Swiss-Prot record, chains B, D, F:
Residues of the full protein shown: 452 to 484 of 539
Coiled coil: 8-33
Name assigned to this protein: Fusion glycoprotein F1
Domain of life, source organism: Viruses
Organism, as annotated: Human parainfluenza 3 virus (strain Wash/47885/57)
Length: 42, 33, 51, 33, 43, 33
């Protein structure tokens, strides 16, 4: 029951890590898009 | 502008460092099993 | 319940793994997108400047 | 090709959306424990 | 089986974490690559 | 330099390959529970 709770919390933290990676990817899209705009528009 | 891309990259670096701290905690919990 | 929880932990990790697999495909496509901007600069920007 | 970047970025956006839903489901299973 | 399954779950999460740590390393390098492209377009 | 980005992108690809292998191994351990 103690080990079960630890595994739960470990997955929960892994999931927070993945959520941070998902926001980082959203911003990488923004960064790439802006470089192509700068090279295309401006 | 390029200086205002730098902001976006800094945002990415900040989220990446949060992600690393979360994995660090998960592994520390697993060490205790 | 204890077997029940072990089964739940397994299915939660399976879902986490599917989230990671999606992130992995996204990153593969980000490689493609950056490659394309760099190739574009090497293919139609620099030659255009020359012309 | 301008549209052939656009096709790639939209592939990333759809995969990013799928990833968030998987994490949401993982988290809810954890709540059921 | 109880102890056996707990240790298997632990190793599964350990391996998932290594997969996330690799993605984190990749993102770090994707920043370098984007920076490099904008840098080569400015210099 | 054009090849000094190409080195970076090739590193990302191999890192991606490692990530995929790690997830496969996690899933197969889950298959043994």
């Amino acid at each position: 029951r103690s080990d079960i709770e630890k595994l739960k919390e470990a997955i929960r933290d892994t999931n927070k890590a993945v959520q941070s990676v998902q926001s980082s990817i959203g911003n990488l899209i923004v960064a790439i898009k802006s470089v192509q705009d700068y090279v295309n528009k401006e | 502008d390029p200086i205002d891309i730098s902001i976006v990259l800094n945002k990415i670096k900040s989220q990446l460092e949060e992600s690393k701290e979360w994995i660090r905690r998960s592994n520390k919990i697993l060490d205790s099993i």
